[model samples]
Target: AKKILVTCALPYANGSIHLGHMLEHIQADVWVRYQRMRGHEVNFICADDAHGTPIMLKAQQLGITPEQMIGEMSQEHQTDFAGFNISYDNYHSTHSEENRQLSELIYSRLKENGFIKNRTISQLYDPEKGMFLPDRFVKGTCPKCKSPDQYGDNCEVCGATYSPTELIEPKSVVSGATPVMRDSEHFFFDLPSFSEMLQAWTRSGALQEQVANKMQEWFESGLQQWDISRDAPYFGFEIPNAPGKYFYVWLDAPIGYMGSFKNLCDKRGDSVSFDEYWKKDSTAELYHFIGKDIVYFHSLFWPAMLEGSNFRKPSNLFVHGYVTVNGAKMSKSRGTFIKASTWLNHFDADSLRYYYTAKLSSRIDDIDLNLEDFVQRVNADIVNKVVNLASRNAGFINKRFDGVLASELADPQLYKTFTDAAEVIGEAWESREFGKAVREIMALADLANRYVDEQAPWVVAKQEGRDADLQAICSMGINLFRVLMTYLKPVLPKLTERAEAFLNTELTWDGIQQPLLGHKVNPFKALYNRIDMRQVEALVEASK
Candidate 1:
């Protein structure tokens, strides 16, 4: 009924997709899948943030071109995503021609609108690398917290953001050489020009109410000019008429969202129009899912850039927090900083996906990846509770009834309890309150299992000529399971596939409205195997 656009923050291509990265992709993918199942027109697209000094240096160390590195990384990223069932319509790159064109197009419009200025500023230059160092390339003590080994741009210890010049005893991360101050003429976006507009927009329900209220801190501190140009040694799109200068990665990275969507439009040809989505007064809605750290960029600078370029602003932005391992930060030494591939090697993808959903809420609070809790929860809830219902009933129905469900409902009143929960569960998914949805669903599962336990279907099977009662009881259990599977279809798609095959029907919201009274199901097949603790230990050992 509505045309919607959604995007996750582009993962910078300098490294593999880690657990931290998968968190956002899975969250957004779940929402989009639910929308599509509800019959809405949706376009979900994302891109690899392929340009920057990090990728350039990494490619050089590997003896490959930046183009080659991103090309290979793009494929690997897509592969990992597909393995997890991430349903991105198009996974593109910031290095594409589409990105280059759009980046320049937006910058030129800013210049025409008198929001661009040129200034000579002092920046950190790494002599050993023979290039100007971006903030992320330098490390030093944080000026605010005086914390040692903080990054130049932000202090992880104190959550303070500052310019690279504010770092104490700064050194280049590339060569371990002390950086020197050098004066360079660079282009700056007059960010203060949009302060009034940004203030109003931030309060416009685009962010969580508390998060919007927190924007008052930045406004009170006052906005300053934002540096948009980096010197010649950068690996990015060259700014027009500015030799030895390139658009900074931040400038081009968010534009990659539009580039990716535009690429999909071009591929669709006559069926879709890029203009209909990006035009100033268009009806299409836009949404961006990002991490808490970058809310400033997406909520402030991005909207300003789009406004200056005469494009539609985002309808809303959902921001999430970091992934902590156990009760602490993810540490490589502790083997908690696990990569996506490492997780896939050790356990099923749906385990991690379901675990995160159980912990996820719309709030921007850090979610802990407690390994012990993960193994216990998955094997117990998914293996013991959810899959157990089907395993017990399917064998009885298939063998005793010749793979046919019963003709009548055993307890249709109890079945209403499961179907009626759809509205509340759908509400949770819409607002990204996933944890609530998970809890509500598990409650229904508890009721279903309890009902079966009271019936004692196995005892009835042991008796002679109780085929009718056994068939009726198992049929009610299967229908209850079908309801739960339809509710969980968006989260655990792989499980839904096996479940749909078992139930002999598609899992959709409409199907939930009507129960399947007499249907033929496939022979019993294992939905998923129970996970053991040793697998978790082996995964951590492999990460180390």
Candidate 2:
């Protein structure tokens, strides 16, 4: 079996998880689950990005230490994910000793390779806060665009980038006081030095096309010096051998991925080093999933850091679009931005899982979850067609037949239909075409419903001297139900278990491609039911 490592973008531990964050997690979780069902040895790891300015500010406001705040938030995040049926092998924090050690190791290697440079730069500093303000810690009006809410780095309104000292009125977010210009010595990573290597790696198509194109455009335009350190009073791992300075949050966030792997290695008692997985070529594939907003960091700066440190480059970087609700970006004022916890209270988690898989394509397309559409699509596809087929027919066999799958249908046409559907769905899943995989599963549902309508097992049961015909119809029904269950194991594992109990056999990929014979059946239950619009409305109102 092929070994795979999958990771989702880690959410910062400053706030509750919203629908947008859930969309990314569920997408990666479904893919990992699919790999496991296909009998591949896979490890899925992710962690809460606990080190950042926002987290520090929030913790201070709460009158708590950063460690205490992150601990509470991490527990809440894990609980919420469990309710959503997301199974992760390990979830770590970026503030751990393991992360600090690994960060120093990588930094040392990069410095030795001439990627690090110390320079004195002028930045905005607040006397009251007693520290130099990072770009995000200082907000001001853009000089060129006159946008009042612009950050020190860029203007959200006009998309113009500038330095904090260049802004018209820079104010410290911590103290609401005007900041003064202060010169400080800081470490900077010379990214332009690695431009040629980045251009070559990107041209090789290891990263996504759109991402590579955007990075190339940025590089060709100009490569700016990236300041990787911040003055004191920041919530992050301090720079090694540099007192009163901390590594920027972005600089340490990606390193969390490596830190988590090292944690796993120590826990598993494996003498094998992290180099085997991260430094060795052809032994492992590294894939990073992120939103379009962070493409420049992952595709350009991240690869440069790895190359300079002699770490293996990422094999693929998948970038996706954001999530919108009711055709607009999720907003609290519109009462459409629902929290992950709120959604779980009203709808089945598996229904949301199925809906996302059905809508998500391989391309970078934004997925909109209109309330009406979400309810209709799930009820129409899963409850009415897929689940109802099994509920209605599985009952008939439960009382009469033993707990086992039926003999294969002798009709060549029927056999061909079953095998063809299995092949199509399996291939789609293997290629990570989740939307197409779900489409094929629903197509098989349509075929099963049509076959049931034509056979009319209830009508055949009443016909005199037609016992053989009744048995054959019931047999085909159970067989078809088994096929649907096998195809759906990746999306809904619990439902698959129910199907296995009904069929009285282990559900495997090979079992799905072929029909089973002679087994007892279990009692039937409704796998899913339609959601009323009233409940959905109430949930949305409560979320607001």
Candidate 3:
């Protein structure tokens, strides 16, 4: 089996996960599950990015330490992910000891290569707090856009990006004091020095095309020095051998992946070296799933840091677009934003999984889940079509066939349809074209429904000496249901369970291609029930 390492964007631990966060997680989770189903050796790793300024400020607001805040939030995040069936091999924290050690190792390598430089730069300092203000601790108007209520980094209203130092009337949110500009020495990574390597790697298709284009645009505009250290009173790993300095959150966040791997190795009593995954050329393939906003950091600066430190660069970086509700950007005040937990309260988790796979593609297109569309799609696809096929046929065979597999299919066309549907859906899934994959699967379900309608087993069973024909139709139905279950297993495992019980057999990819002749059928239940529209609306309301 080919080995692979997959990572999703690390979520901040300061807030609850909303529908937007689930988009990325579900995308990554579906891909990972597909890979596992295809029989590959894959390790999925992700962590809560707990070492940022926002986390610290939020902790203060809640009258708790950063550690305490992240501890509670991470647990909640993990619980939400579990509800969505996101299976991570290692879900770690960026604030762990292993992460600190790995961060130090990476920093040491960059420093040894002379890629790090120290310079005194002006920063926002709060006099009342008597401390250097982190970016989240300060708020101001965007100098370029003149928009009020803008953060230190970017203006959400005008889309103008600027540094925290460029903000006018910056005030410390923690102390409610106007921050004064003060010069302080901080370390920076000389990004321009590694521009050529970044350009080369991106051109080699290690990064996605859109990401590569964005990085090129940013580089041509100007490559600014990246700050790799922050002042004191920050909640992060202290810089090794550099007293009074802490590694910047961005600098330490990627290291958490490595730390998670090391932690797994230690737990398994394995002496495997980091070189196996991080430095080797062909041992593993690394893929990262992230949102479009952070494209520059992952595709450009991340590659530069890895190349400079002699680490293996990522093989592929998948970028997804943001989520919109009701054709608009999710807004909390508008009552359109849906929290992960809130969605869980009303809808089946598997249905959401199926919905995302059907809507999203393998590109940077934003996937919207309007309330009405979500309801109609799930009902039409999962309930009326997919589940209806099994519900309408399973009971027929359970009473008449006496748990015996009917004779072999005498009709070649029927057999061909089953085989063709399975192959087409399998290929689509292999290419990560989940939208097309699901459509193909649904087409087969439609075919099954049509076949049942035309066969008219109910009429055939009442005819004189037509028991064989009834058994034949029942046989074809069960076989087609088995194929559908196999195709949908990666997206909906529970549905596969119902298929297994009905056929009295274990489900596998290989099993779908073969015929079951002698296996006894067991009692079956409805795979899924249609969701109520009011329940979905209630979920939307509760999310607010």
lDDT of 1 by residue, 306-332 (tens): 998899999999888899988788889
- Sorted by lDDT, highest first, which candidate order results? 1, 3, 2
What TM-score do all the candidates reach, one by one? 0.94, 0.93, 0.93
lDDT score of residue 438 within candidate 1: 93
TM-score of decoy 2: 0.93
Better of 2 and 3 by lDDT: 3
Tens-digit lDDT track for model 3 on 1-544?
A: 8888999988988889888889888888888877887789888999999997777777988899999999999999999999888889989988998899888888899999999999998878998877788676678999987887676688888898878878888878778788898988999998999878777876886565777788778878988789989887788998988887898999988888888877877777778645688884657888998999877778777878888888888888888998888889988887788888888888867888888889877678888888788888889988888777667766756787777767686355875787777666777776668899998888888888888889997798889989778777877777777777778888886666677777778777777667777557876667788877798768767867
TM-score of 3: 0.93
Task: Give the range where candidate 3 is weakest over 10 consecutive residues by summed lDDT.
Answer: 403-412
Model 1, residue pairs in steric clash:
none
lDDT on C-alpha atoms for all candidate structures? 0.89, 0.79, 0.82
The alpha-carbon lDDT assigned to residue 55 of candidate 1 equals: 80
lDDT for model 3: 0.82
